[model samples]
Each structure stands twice: as structure tokens, then as C-alpha cells.
Target: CPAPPPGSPDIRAIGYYTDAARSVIDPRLKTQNDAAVKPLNAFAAHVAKFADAYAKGADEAAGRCALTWLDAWARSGAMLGRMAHVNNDQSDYMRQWTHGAAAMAYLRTQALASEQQRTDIETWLKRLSAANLAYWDNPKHKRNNHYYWTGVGIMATAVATRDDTLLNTAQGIYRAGIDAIEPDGRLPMEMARKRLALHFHDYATAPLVLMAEMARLQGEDWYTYRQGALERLAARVADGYRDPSWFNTQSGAVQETATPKASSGWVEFYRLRSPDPMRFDAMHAAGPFQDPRMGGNLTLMAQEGIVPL
Candidate 1:
């Protein structure tokens, strides 16, 4: 959250962070964070609560209630201030993380929406599409997973809206990620996190794994691009999860009982694609991959049989 350019508007982006000791940073940031999170959270809650009923076309009244919540958020122009492009380097991150959650929820509901509801939804989707590419297309942060997450978000928006340009841009980012991978399967930018090197390695791979999944579902093949670049990354992380000593050597850490902070369903995702016994056993031993921002039932969703969108 850098200061605006000289003589620019003094408006501060609203958000907060809890410190290690569990303290709130600011009342205002908490408000802004809630403002951004509440509607998105509600949108997801309705989807989880009603997706099964809606799928069978059995409880449309309940379904429409959920859909209306989505519509109302878009109708109110959810997060327009955040959606608006700004010179602040930090502004896009706020948009990216918030919009990433909203966009995934939007994907789950987009096809099920009514014609009128779809129109409002598309309007919001397009706004998010433009906002993500505006920053990510030519980003200030070229290293690490920030750009990759934006790529994943826009790619998700592309799938939801069937926007070819966004899809192409998303693909371009996919290629960029492949190019970023070293022959040894280490992502230098992520490794730069030092003690959290292994932690970030797992964090960074989540979006890229989804990118690969999205490509496969859309009749393209990115999983094997660059000789299975993502697979190699996942394998290394799996190994690191079991034994952090290799990473500790690189990251210069020797703490006791270290573990990778991985998302809940990623190992299952990687295993489904690249079926490695060593990696599969390691991924299972590692842990589950779950994030509310990502729609739940992720391992289930990753299987081609149930990839709803």
C-alpha cells in the first residue's frame, strides 16, 4: 500500500491485517475489508447451500434467492472503487484477491443464471476482466504468483463469459509461467521468500495448477507444456513437504518441524494429472487443500467428471 503519486488524491484503500499477536491494524481497513468480503462470502454461501438443489432444478425458489444475492451485489456495482484502476501499486492486489473469490463464485453460478440476471452478472464480470488485465497485462510486479493469480482470475472470467481475448491473455500468462520455471523445477521468485521459500512454492503453484486444469477442460493441453513443467514443480514441492532439508539448505533455515503451507486440494489436483506414486503418497502425507476463496469440493471439482465449469 504505497502512497499515491505526488499531488494525487489522498484516498487510502480500505483494508486491514491482523498482526502476529492477533491485533487489528485499523477500524477503517477492517470496514473496507468487510465491505469487500461480505457480499462475496454471501454469494458463495448461497451457492454451496443451494447448488445441489439448483442442479436438480428442484428448489429454484431457494436457488433464485441465492442468484438474487449475486445479482444485487453486481447491481450495486460491487467494489467499483476497488475495481477502478489506480496508480497505487497495492490497489490491484486488493482487487485481485477480492475479485478472485467473486469470480470463482461467479463461474459456479453464471450458467445457471436467468437472462436478466446474466446480463447484470456479465456486466460485473467484464468490469473485473478489464480491471485484472489493466494491471496484469503489463504489470509492475512481474515476479512470483501475483501475476499468475491475476492470470487465473482473468482466465476464470474468460471461461465464465466466453471472452476469447481474456482467454488468450490467460493463455499468454500460462506460457509466461512455464518460461519462468527453471530446468530444476524451482521458481526463483518464490524461492526468494527465504524461510517461507517452500511455503511460497506451494502457494504459487495453486493458481498455476488451476490454469493447467482450465486449459485441459477447454480442449487445450498445458499440463505437458514445456515437458510437464508444472508437474515437476509439484513433485519437488511434494518432496519438500516430506523433507524440508533440501529447501532449508537453499532458504538458509534450520528450524525444527517445518512444513509447507499448501492449499488443501492441490496435491489431489496434481496427482490426478501426473499420477506419480512417489508424489501421490507424498501429497497425501502432506495434507488437504482447501481455501474458501476457491470454491469448495475442490478435489471433487478437479476430476474431469465433475468440473462444473
Candidate 2:
């Protein structure tokens, strides 16, 4: 395979949390952070190309291409940073999100990886997962969406590496999130976003749904865990998308209409399990979902049956 393009892995990232609550962003800081993190996003997009190709049936060539690219990063130790920063730093969050995406991408074609390539790639991913686990495992870490996203990354790593310990930890995170859901399906942490409560709820639902789907693949029924709280959370987010009035009343601030994106890509997986009329309609409206963070084109991944029913 041709040599992989130059990698832009940086060891440090500026904190992007701008508000006292750490729930809002300053456009300037966001722009700076986005620039710094562009390399991670690009890497995920690169993985998607191969993963999409393999899922669409160009198996061998795509898998080899993926290994070639990933092996380059593995050798270079890209993203293997100490990542020491103040409490407000989001570097760990970025690493975990990208780790989930890259690990899932690897899972798509790991069978085709050569022994050496597999070792390098899996080791690199394990190291990344370890960093995330250490950071998020702190007792002080808020058990919110960030924690859930970390679990999603760890869950992907667990499945890819077949690490039972990591799997258990990830499942615990998923269970905690599910248990935190209100009877009405609201996530209290996300609902605390005030003006962005609805948006945060939508954001929080993605990782939880993805984590549940990953667990389902392991013969576990996380979707129905805790009296089907996952479904309740999904229902609440769906209803909030349809009408934010309830959230506005509860949050004491008018909710923002969340734009459809990769963050909400979990809808593809959720729709497979529920297929509710309203959600199906919403899914149709949000067709062609692609998010590197969710392991690329979720719509394509779902249709290809890469993630089993």
C-alpha cells in the first residue's frame, strides 16, 4: 500500500469549556479547539473510507488499506499523549471519542489484519483506552454524557480486544447512565443544560444507544436494562426533538433545536430495535447519517448488517 499521509497528532489540546457550568462554548475557543482536533477527525474519516469499502464488499482491499493506515499511526504512537491538563480540559474527551470511532473502524476489518498489524493496532488502541479509563474512572468525574462517551470508546476497545475487564467497566458505565434516567426518560444531568437541555439530551442519547447496541452484540440486552430506561431516554429525546416545550418548561429556558448530525447518529441503531412510527419518520428525515465518532456512516453500517440485529 502507498505510504500513509503525514500524521498530525498533537500531545496537548486547549480546554474548550467556556462557561462556568462547562456547558457552553465560546466561538473563538471552539474554533481553536476544532483546528487542533482536526487531525483526529481526519483520521476517523480515513478509517471510514476503508470501513465503508469493506462493509460494501471490497473486503480484502479495504481491510488491507485500513491496516496500512492504522499501522502507520501505531508505529508513530499518534495520540499517545500524557494529556495532563487542568480539570476543564477536553483533551481526554476527544481522545475517548476518537478512540471509539477508530476502534470500531478496526473491528470492521480486524479479521483481515495480518498478525503483526493486528498486534500493533490492538496494542495502540488498548493504550488509548487505558488513558481514557484512567481519566474517566476518577471518583470525582461527573457521571454524565462525557462519562458515557468514554464508556462507548472503552466498549469498542473491549470488544475489539476481547478484554473482559474493560467490557465490565464499560457495562457499568452504561448501567449507571440507564439508571440515572428519570421515569419520564429525561437525563437529569443533560436536562441541567438549561437553554441547551434538549440539545444535551440528544447528545447524551447517542453514546448510550451506541453502548447498548455494542452490548447487544455480546448477547447482553442493555436496551431493556433497568426497566427499559434506555428506551425511555430515547423516547424523551425523540419527543423533545418533536417539541421542546416540555424541556423548556422543565429547564426554565427555551431549548435550542439540535441540528441533526453524527452525534445523533445513534438513531439508526435505535430505530432498528424499536422502529416506532415517529422515530422512523424522524430517522427518514435524518437520512444518510454519517459520524466518524459513531464509526462512520451509521446508515450504511446498519444496512450492511455489520451490526447484527
Candidate 3:
């Protein structure tokens, strides 16, 4: 087990982009925001490394490292306490991502955690989950990718903490996303992104796919919910990547085809359950996928196998 870091850094507030479409970026705020989250991101990367190591047959040592790291943060209240936001809800957004990342990482390795470590880490995660639920549950929050992402985080926490209330809220968001899908598999809110419509659709799919897979592990068939609406959404995103013409035509704006690498990692999970030659081939060609926000190397997680919480 790698030695725990010296101490946790205070990350009390952050600032993000300024614009309705989220296309505008103030460099100063971006840099500050990035700096603030550096420690959190670094810890997430370490968690990913732990997963990769554990999957590669270093289970005992990897588990120790992960527990030490996670417990250190938990005991120090790293991401707990009040968080201030500079550009309206920036801290909440960051917390959701961090919460999801941490919770997912814990889920992957909780089987190896000692009772005390498990209690500390899970209690910390539940606190973060509560904060996420408070912010995203508000009726004013847009039911877009942010909402879906929050659902993934809370769902992961729900599984770890076994909180039925949290699970129901997260599942509700998944249903909301499924219900938002149009007949043509387009998400009206994502499509409204104009030039970034296809990109956002791709972005939105990541959390929904993860949430569905997580739900499936718990005996809920969310993937096939609402007449397989989730499948339609996934297919639409995969197709969008192959050809942006449809999105462009529908949105009346040229699509951005350069999808984020992290956004597509969930395809590994989706491909395992469904038979889609094209998507499977695409995923294989892409090879191993890794994203800190999704608990490190998701491709490896699938290969090593995800143990239900």
C-alpha cells in the first residue's frame, strides 16, 4: 500500500465558466478552478491507479493503498464542510463530480476495506451524496447532463451506503432522462446546445449508461426502461459520432464531432450487456478506456469485473 499523503488540502470554494450555454470561459477563473480541484483530481487518479493495480493481480496491496488514501481523506474531512461557489453553483458541480468519482472508486474496492475503513469512507460519501441531492433535487435545476451526472454520483453513493431514498432519487433522474428521449432518440435539451448538441448527447450518455449498469446490478432493468429508450439514446450517440449530419440537420448548427475521451468510457459497460457489432467494434478499436470521474480505468473494471455492493 502506498503511504497516505501528508495531509488533506482545503478545497472550500471554486469558480467555473460564465455563460448560459457554458461555452464561454474566463481564463483566470478557469485556472483558479483548476488549481482548487488539483488535489481532489489527484486523489481520484490515485484511486484509479489502485483499481488498475488491483485488477492486475495486486489485490491485497492495492486495497491497502486505496483504503489508506480514502481513510485519510475521510478522517480529515477533505471534501466535507461548506463549499463556496464563485460563478453560481460551481462548487456544487465540482462536488457532484468528486462525489461520483470517490463513491464509484469505493464501490469497486469496498470488499477489501476493513470494517472501520468502510464505515469512515461510506459515511463521508453519504455526506457528499446528501449535498448533491440537495442541489440537484431543487426544481430549478435544469434536467440536463448535470442532473444525469448528479444521479450517477448519488446512485453510486446509494449503492455504497444502501440508502433507499438516495437510490430512488437517482433512479428517478435516470427515468427522467429516459422520458426526455424523443421518438428519434434525441434529447431535446442536449440538442439545444447548438453546435455542441452531438457532443452533449455523447456527454449525457456516459452517466445514464453507468446508472443503468449500476441499477442492473441491483436487479433493476433500467436499460430497457420506457420501451428501451436508453438503448435508443446510446445508439443515437454512437451514430452521431459516425455521422454528425443528422444532429446538424436537426439542431440547425454544425455539430462538434470531437467527443470527449472520458465521456465514452461507459461504452465498455454497455457493450458487455448488449450486442451491437458496430459499437463493440468501435469500442475494441478504441481499446482500454480510463476516466477518473468514472472510477479510473472503466475498461479494466469491466474486465476484472464489477462486484455489486
Candidate 4:
């Protein structure tokens, strides 16, 4: 989609506009352009297939298949986070997108879900940590991506009663993101999505939303301290969302949303953690390429309420 990126396999993208008639509109489901999150294209296939099934009176099949797709896709390229920690950048934190989907996994499968389903979920997360945060302790963790991924992955595991590894990994990542966010609520890496000053951070909010609730649930700042600051940052994004032109990125032709590209559970998670911070509002926006497991989020956001925020 994103001009096929540097190494993309999409020939259509490679030949995008030189023909002068090559439409920017791709027949593919993804409507935006993003290269840093190159892996999302693969992961989104699973999500797209799942959405198709569920949309056409195939809920059971969609749910069942989503379990499988999620596992396989994660393996392809779901890293903890992207490269970040310089400039007023929101991009360095791209890995948070993976956690948002992990959040979907956490929220979708009920704790008492089927054994097969539960196994699929747990195994996926375990693989996530081993692959991403294995070197979390040393200088390798300079970027903090591993930490966010570990936190979100583990948080999902803990809620699902997956294993101790989940909680432990989550705590590690929570510390990583907090240390990275800084006291000013600005994520240097987050602002770098080629958006620079026009950057918007709904992406960074993923870990914050989860961590806030995690802190309250676990009684540890490992999730909440940074969670609070993350919430403050989310509020700033919320304010930006209120204004039609606030923080709009001039880099991308398509202006998605200013209030953080996240799931309702994430915002609800913050509300559950500390209602005093801000009265959470449900937003129906979605990111570039979503995992098909996002059906629940799409549904929930639509039916969130009759009350206006």
C-alpha cells in the first residue's frame, strides 16, 4: 500500500503513479499508506478474512478461524515495538500496534474459553516474549520496544490466566515504556512516523491504557505510574481530536485520527484504572491495517452507548 515501501512485493504499488492513471485507491482493504508497519499487511490478511466470515452470518467460523490466524500472523512479524527514542516522534513506538491487537486477543477470549482456543492464545503470547524480549535485560533493550510488547503480551496472558511468564513479561515491558515516555508526556519515538510536528499519538496510548488498569489491578506502578502519564498524553490527544485541525500530520495525505489509533478496551481500560483522569469516550476509528480479531472492538465501539461524550 504505502508506495510498496522499499522491499514490498506489491508491483502495483511500485508502479503507483508514474502511469499517471495508477489510482492511489488500492483494491486491497487497507485504505492508508504506511511502510514502517510493513508486517501489518501480513497480519491484516488474517483479520480481513475473519471479518468477511463474521460479516456474512459466519460468526462461529470467524471466531474459530480468528484464533488460528492470530497465532500464525504473530509469528510472521509481530515485534514488541518499532525503533524510537529521538525527535518528537510517535513512530519509534510502532510496536504498540501489536499490543493493541494483543489486547483484542485478551478481551475477545473469555477466561473460561475452550481449551484449544486458550492454548492457541497462550502459546502465541509466549512466542511473542521469547522472540521479542529475550534480551530485555542488557543493552539490547535500548529502544524500549521489547518492554511495551512484553507488557501488553503479558498483560493479556495475566488476564487470561495464561501463565506467570505473562505477568512477569508485562511488568518488564511496563517499566520499559514508562522509562521511555519521560516526565513531559512526550514520546520521542512516537513523533517520528514521518509526521514530525504533525504527529498524533493514539498509538502510544495502547500501553498506557492497559498499564493504567494493570496497575490498579496489580497494585504496581510497573503498569500504572507510566500509565498515569500515558493517560495524560491520551487526554491531550483527546483534546486534539476535538479540534478538526489540531495536530494533523502534513506528511500523509490521508488524515486518520488525532485521538490515538487504539481500541475501546484501551480507553475503557484507562477508565477502569482511574476514572478521575478523564471520562473516557469511545472512538470508532481504526488504524492502517487491523488484525481481523478486531471485530469485537468494531462492534463494541458502534454499540458503546446512546449517551454522547
Candidate 5:
């Protein structure tokens, strides 16, 4: 890979990765963008890659690849994540949505829909909701992935269904996210990657706005924090992503990756929650991430990790 432009943070945080074990010895494990856990770390990569490839005009290839991976991921990958203790049923579930619902939306045009895929998605969708509610209610210590994904899963559901009830559910859940975050713009637990705090938000918050937007569309009156708060967080997260220096010291966004998609969620966030278009342009860049979703994320991070913020 080419060196980042002079000012860009080194992307040292390792972004998002899957293999926690690899993360233990690897340097890139700090962020969800880690590459090792691919297919296993976050199940969504299988589907999302297909959608992204399709979005980039790699439709059939993307769909075929996605299906091929989904089939294995559901059977073997799940076992891998759990057995290795790297995968969680809750927060990490958003990785699947990026593939499942998002890909479904993508599949509407990109890939021919499959009854089997539909059934498979439906089954996991229920698991997503169930796991989500379970985590939200109980919130085990190390298990809180991020409040953002919780909402994202809900929003994805709404987009998938266009059902008013699900939309309302999206609204309710988004409000809950607001409750979880602190005024300091930090989700301490989610940020506990020993660093890479904002990067976590990158993947986490993107989906959050998705949920909030869906909620507002469905008439969920979130009477808590102001709207633009999340947008501001987006900007803050963007700013941090801009550099996101190693160990939380640097912050900047990635132009070549998912920065736009990541921030787009925030764009939707601003559009609905804050409606701040000024910064929404930030979302148009690269979106959120290109974090590795399979393989040895930790080891990968260790090998390539930038100095911790």
C-alpha cells in the first residue's frame, strides 16, 4: 500500500479487525478494522464486500463471492469467532448488517435475490434483534460492542422492511444510544481498545445514524439529546479519523476506504438527528472503513500498527 499523504495519520490504530487472538500478538487488533477476523470477526464483511464490489460495479462477482462466504461464515466462521473467543453475538453483529440488510438492499439491484439467502438473513436478523436487546438490557462488561451498532442493526431492519413498527423500534433504540454515550464524546467501554477510540466510533456510529434516521422517519420522538449532537460527534469522529494517530494521539479520515459510508451514517445522522449538511460532505469522502474483517487482526495490527494515540 502507498504511504498516506504527508498529513494523514499513519492509520496506526489498525482500524477494525476480527481475530482477537491474532490481535493479542498482532499489532492491528486494537480497532474493529483489523483484518485477521475477516468473515469471522464481524460476519457482515462477507455480505458487505459483495455489496461494495457490486456498488463499485462488481455485482455478479460480488454476489457470488458474498454467497460463497456467507455459506462458510455461517457454519465455520461462527465456530471460529466463538471458539477463539473473538466474536460476540451482539455489537459485532453490525458487521453482518453491512452484509445482510445493506447487501439485501444492494442485492435488490446487484444480485438476484435468493429465497435461501432471504431465509438465512431473516434468521440472523432475528438473532441480531434478540442479541441486541439482550446486550442492551444486560450489557455484560466486555460485551458492550457499541451503542451505535445496536441502533444500526435496528435501522437496517427498518430499511429492509419499511415496516412502521420496525422503524419505531429503530427510533426507540437510537434514543437508547444517546443515553449510553457521554457528553465527552466518548464511549469508554467501546473505546477500550487500549487506543483507537474514535475508530471504534467510525464503525459503530455509522450504523447509529442509520437507526436514528429510520426512527425519525417512523415517528419515534427521541426527546433526549439535541439532534446535531451526533453530527458534531461525526465531525469529531471525522476529525479524529482524519488523523486517528496511534494510541488515540492522531486523528484523520481515510479517503480511499469507507470514510464516506462511515460518515454517511453520520450524514443520515445529521440529516435526521442534526441535519448538518456542512459536515455531511465529510461523509462523502471514503465512507467509514476498509478494516480487515477476516484473518489475524491482532497480529496484523501488531505488524502494521501505527504509534498508538
Candidate 6:
């Protein structure tokens, strides 16, 4: 593969992989390690290829080749099936959700796809939407990042497929998310992660912001939906990012080691929506937004200054 241009973080590389094992060599940890790295890397490459093919209008043969993997995954439960373990749900569920969303986004962008392909994809998306809603549409998941991601996945799929029921489900859960924020700009569910409380709080911010952007595109003012809660949350997280002492104090950790940093999409999203000099300094301190899992091209997607690939 060609080298990444200049200073851009290489999205081709795995950003977050962990040993979730109880001991130094637990098989479950190994499994989660592979599970986290492999699927996401494949999804990122495939989606980037498909996006390129769609952008340049690849020849029918090449286009079909680019699409072959997605078609296979779609039929084999790209969004509908495939999580086998109860113990691994929290660590593994987001991979499926992110892959499904990115793939669906590309599907929406494909201008030359066949009618049959479109029909099959839409059917798959709706089925996935229903399944996700049935599983995650409760207060149990709604108050955390789980529901936020589920919201974005369903809402994006709904917009692509024009499914009203799916869209309504997205909005309902989004309301639950809005209500989850505390007056002190913290999310209780994320705080419940204990030692990883600050980490989860930062992790939760990206998907919620994505949902808000999607809502705005659909003519809903979600950014201002709950007394400017999103900005408040961003401010709180930015402070934590700038000084680990706050997170260490709040989360009760000797040293906070959050992989991939919480700043990926948080800073760009916050700066784009509610810019301030101090916040810009803090966000700049955290780093640039470039996580492939969250649509990869953050600068492009967020309408911040373009960071050319």
C-alpha cells in the first residue's frame, strides 16, 4: 500500500486493541484482541476502497469486485447476525455496528448499483435496523454509549433506506441519550465504568455528536435539544483530555491510559459546532481527528479544514 501522506495518522493501522483477559494469557483476551483488530481493519480498507470506486465510477467489473465482500457480509448477517458470546458483547458489539454503518453509508453513495442490489441492501438494512432496535431499545442500553452508536447506525440506515419506523426508533433512543446527561456535564452510565469512567465518557461523545449531526440533516435540531448538553459534555471531556489529573481524580486511577485518545472526533466536532479559542487550544493539544472507525475522514466529514489524504 502507498505510504500515508505526510503527518496524517495511518488509518490502515489498528488504533485500539486490548487484552481483555483475566490473566496474562487468557484465550478470551486473545480472542478479543484478534476480534478488535481484524474486523475493523478489514472494514476500513473495504469501505475506503468502495468509497474510492464510487467516487471515480469504477468499471462494472471492478465495482462488482469492490462490492463482492460487502455483498457476502450483507447476506451472511453483516448487520443481522454473528455475535456468539454473551461475555464479549460489550467489547465486540461496536465493531459490527461501525462496520454496518460505514458499509451502509457507502451503499447510499453508490450511484451505479443495480436495482436488485439496492433492494437486497435496503432489505438487509431494515432487518438489521429492526434487530438492533429490538435488542438495544431499552433503558438498560439507552443511557450509555451503546444506545448512542445504535442510534447513529439505525438513523443512517433509515435515512439511506427511507424507513420511517427505523427513523422513529432512532429519535426515541436519541431522546433517552439526551436525558442521560447529568447537570455537571457527565454521563452516569459512562461514569459507571469505574476505572475507565473518563475513557468511556470520551468514547461516548463521538457517537452522540454523530447522531446529532444526522438529526440535523434530517431537519431535527438535536444539538440544541437538551439545554446545550453536547457542548457541556465536550467542555468537560476537553478539560479531562488537557489534564489527566481531573480524570485520574474523578475515575480513581493512578495513571489514566486511554488508547487512541478520546480526542479523535471530539475536538473537531466541538470546534466545528461551538468554537472557542481556549477550547481550540485544548482540542489542538489533544490531537487531530482521524479514526477510521468513526468514518475515517473526520476533517472532511466534519467540514473542518480539509486534511488531504
Q: Pick the candidate with the highest TM-score.
A: 2
C-alpha TM-score for every candidate? 0.77, 0.91, 0.89, 0.53, 0.53, 0.75
The global Cα lDDT (0 to 1) of model 6 is: 0.57
Candidate 6 weakest lDDT stretch, 10 residues: 5-14
lDDT of 6 by residue, 1-309 (tens): 222112111112112324331112346655655654465456655555544444343444444554454455555555344544444454335543554445444443545556766766667666656666666546555446766777766777776666788778878777777788888888876765555666777778877776666666567777667757777777777777556676566545533555444235656655767745367565555455555445454544556321112
CA lDDT, every model vs. true structure: 0.63, 0.76, 0.76, 0.45, 0.43, 0.57
Candidate 2 deviant stretches above 4 angstroms = 1-10, 84-87, 275-278, 307-309
- Which digits, one per residue and each the tens of the lDDT, describe model 4 over residues 1-309? 111112221112111122122223343323223443455544544444444444445365555565555544433433433344332222323433454455444444333246665666566566554544554546644453324544664565565564666666566566666666656455656544433222335555655445444444444544434446665566655555565343444223334444444343355444544546444453433322223323233333333420112
* Candidate 2 lDDT: 0.76
Q: Provide the lDDT at 62 for model 6.
A: 43
State the lDDT of candidate 1 residue by residue for 211-277, as single tens digits. 7776665788786668677777887787776778877787666423554333536666667667564
Cα deviation in Å at residue 63, candidate 4? 2.5
lDDT of 3 by residue, 32-123 (tens): 77777777777778886786677677466886687788888888887666666565776677777877877887877787888899889888
Superposed model 5: Cα runs more than 4 Å off: 1-38, 41-46, 56-111, 114-117, 135-139, 142-145, 161-169, 181-195, 201-204, 213-225, 238-276, 279-309
Clashes of each: 5, 0, 0, 17, 68, 0
Better of 3 and 5 by lDDT: 3
User: What does each candidate score in C-alpha RMSD?
Assistant: 7.0, 2.4, 2.6, 9.6, 11.8, 7.0
lDDT, candidate 4, at 225: 49
Q: How well does candidate 3 match the true structure in TM-score terms?
A: 0.89
Q: How close is candidate 1 to the true structure, as a TM-score?
A: 0.77
